[PDB]
Amino acid sequence: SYYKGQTALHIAIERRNMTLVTLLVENGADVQAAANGDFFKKTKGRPGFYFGELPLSLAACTNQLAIVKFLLQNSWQPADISARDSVGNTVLHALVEVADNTVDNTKFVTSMYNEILILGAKLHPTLKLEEITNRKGLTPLALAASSGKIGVLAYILQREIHEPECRHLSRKFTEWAYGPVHSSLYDLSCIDTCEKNSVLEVIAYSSSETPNRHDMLLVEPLNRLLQDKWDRFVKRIFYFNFFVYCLYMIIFTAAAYYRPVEGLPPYKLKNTVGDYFRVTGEILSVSGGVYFFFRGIQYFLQRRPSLKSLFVDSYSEILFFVQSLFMLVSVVLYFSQRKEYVASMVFSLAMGWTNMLYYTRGFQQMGIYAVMIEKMILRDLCRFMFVYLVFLFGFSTAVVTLIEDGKYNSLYSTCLELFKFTIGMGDLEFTENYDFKAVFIILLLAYVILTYILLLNMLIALMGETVNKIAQESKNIWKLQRAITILDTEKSFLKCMRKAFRSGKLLQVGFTPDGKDDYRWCFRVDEVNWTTW
Amino acid sequence: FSQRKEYVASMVFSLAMGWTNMLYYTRGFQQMGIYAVMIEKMILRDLCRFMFVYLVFLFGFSTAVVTLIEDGKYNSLYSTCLELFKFTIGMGDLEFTENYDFKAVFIILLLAYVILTYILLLNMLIALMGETVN
Amino acid sequence: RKGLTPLALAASSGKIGVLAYILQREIHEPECRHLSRKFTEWAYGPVHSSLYDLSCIDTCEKNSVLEVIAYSSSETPNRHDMLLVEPLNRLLQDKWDRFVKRIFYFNFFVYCLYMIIFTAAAYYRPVEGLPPY
Ligand code: NA
């Protein structure tokens, strides 16, 4: 089962013997044999070499150029290119999947890709390879984007061919040049809207374990495209949303500040303006709470993410949902003739007020500041509170055990007294009912020294990580966050209107191999070159 | 079992030390283990080199201040040492006694002590990060 | 006389280069393969699997390399950096992940339970005078 399915053609190909391969081919053996052995499986056991399951793919992925040309250019029985294996991957898909982000590997892969593509175009110009999809509905470009292959994506996006009868395979062109300045064009077909899955959509919604989510948006066209969309309309949409949220929060605060103090709600309103205003404010607050609840549940339903990504990703959708839950529980308690609705309301109010850092994205420096804040919260709280809590509990138990009786004979009181030392209110003489004063003093001094050493170690370790390798990541994270916001806003059409669109229609190549012309929704960029004439 | 009362002191020392003796199990977790390693290295490499100067300064200024005072509650050495130690944790008084002469000398001594101690703490935290060049 | 072989002597005195060379020695000549310690079971395309000899590394019945490196005194030059050699890191990771993890977790749980019991017992001591009670 492990070596099952192998055929002589595979050995001949993978031994680097051209003459033996030719002699074996002369016999007439089938060139469409597929090996289903477990040794060629995806990740079934660490050992294995996936190569597409076809002899043509084997030749392509093993540095074989003359051999693959011979296989594809024989008069006896040429091998079809549109072949698909059990998984459905083609030679192009296998080439994409073999890449592992190494400079030599990247140059090899791109050279082989270009050669095979031009040969395929030359032999059968009528057919197009890049639009063939496997079972998962992924094209080579989508597959490259999903798995974080920087080199292949970068090569494909700005591909340039400078040969007659092959211009129509290119994606980057040159509209005109004059002196030190020339303007280029980039093809946007299947980048922002493909009707199945675009590059931007795949990169934005990918799970966090993907290798290079942050750094994959630095490729040329994407940055400018996102900036254009933003500056056209996302700015106005975002500012309107921010204003509305601020107004709602102000109303909620003002309504909560004037609650009545009589006992056992509900309270019967009186014939005065203040009562009407207060009731209106409360109604508005409840409406906002239910709105946020429904939006959050809708998002959680559509995305359906995993568990480990619920805090690394969606770090804000959970907070808004929790605030809404607090509001609803407060309402339920209020209409049940109890008094804990006040506690629920204050928790909701504080959390909502602190939940306003979400809107700092859209401003560069503030966004970077917020990114650093959240990274530190998620990366240091757990690692630095454990030791402190251990020390506090141990010394508090010792001190409480020493005392005989009095007001400080509990555990809560002594824990609070020892916590006071960390914020600059230590007493050192907060009780006198005990024996062996020397033990008391020694314990307190040891606790103080250990805590201060611990704080010093925490601030040195915290700056150690920043070797200047903290800002370049923060900027990329902020850019990814803004990109997600732009995509979401575009998907949620403003009102019922629809004006957004990538760029203008244009004629660049003129004519395909067929007589008919074509249009490909380009996006012009102006650049000035002084050297390398 | 000898009908005494110091077993309480022994028991509390044992309890506190045992509770703090639990950092041994942080090995087996990568980041926590590295944190504990840094903690122990700092304890063994800075305590002796940084407490000597502070204790010297504290004792000298405490002896001077005690010698200045005439009589009262703060006419001992333990009391004045504790009062001057309070300054380091944010509870300085600057007027904790009034039974003496030559108030200017008292104020000058206290100000000099405060300035020297703060300079010393600053130097300690700069020297401590200097060693970490990554 | 001290019962040290060249490998043990190299490990004890902190000679990184000699130890690194000896551990992964490779000979590619006929009639001399049996002197090697690293081999090649098979190769296929861009992938090939190697083998490492573990005789007298983790159990020699007198003194192994791991035992000598672990218990060496602190004045030895390169105790910390001598475990970065190839086979040793993976060997230690394997042993850990097989069974030391479970042993360690059980020990941690037992210690926590004992400490909780001791704290609770000490918190409720009687206050009458002149023990025993
Ligand atoms: Na203070």
Numbering used by the authors:
A (entry chain D): 197 to 603, 627 to 752
B (entry chain A): 531 to 603, 627 to 687
C (entry chain A): 331 to 463
What do the authors say?
The capsaicin- and heat-activated receptor, TRPV1, has served as a model for deciphering lipid modulation, which is relevant to understanding how pro-algesic agents enhance channel activity in the setting of inflammatory pain. Identification of a pocket within the TRPV1 transmembrane core has provided initial clues as to how phosphoinositide lipids bind to and regulate the channel. Here we show that this regulatory pocket in rat TRPV1 can accommodate diverse lipid species, including the inflammatory lipid lysophosphatidic acid, whose actions are determined by their specific modes of binding. We captured several states of TRPV1 ranging from channels in which the VBP is empty to those bearing different bioactive lipids, including distinct phosphoinositide species, brominated phosphoinositide analogs and a pro-algesic lipid, lysophosphatidic acid (LPA). Together, our data show how the VBP accommodates a range of bioactive lipids and how occupancy of the site corresponds to the structural status of the pore.
To determine the effect of the resident PI lipid on channel gating, we devised a protocol to eject this lipid and render the binding pocket empty. We then washed out the competing vanilloid followed by reconstitution of the channel into lipid nanodiscs of defined composition and devoid of phosphoinositide lipids. These samples were applied to grids held at 4 °C or 25 °C (temperatures at which TRPV1 is normally closed) and then taken forward for cryo-EM analysis. The final maps were refined using C4 symmetry and resolved to 2.9 Å and 3.7 Å for the 4 °C and 25 °C samples, respectively. In both cryo-EM structures the vanilloid pocket is, indeed, unoccupied by either a resident PI lipid or capsaicin. Interestingly, we observed that Y511 is flipped toward the binding pocket in these two structures, akin to what is seen in the agonist-bound state, demonstrating that reorientation of this fiducial side chain primarily reflects ejection of the resident lipid. We also see transition of a π-helical turn in S6 to an α-helical configuration (π–α transition), resulting in rotation of the lower half of the S6 helix by one residue. This π–α transition rotates the gating residue L679 away from the central axis with a narrowest restriction now formed by rotation of M682 into the pore.
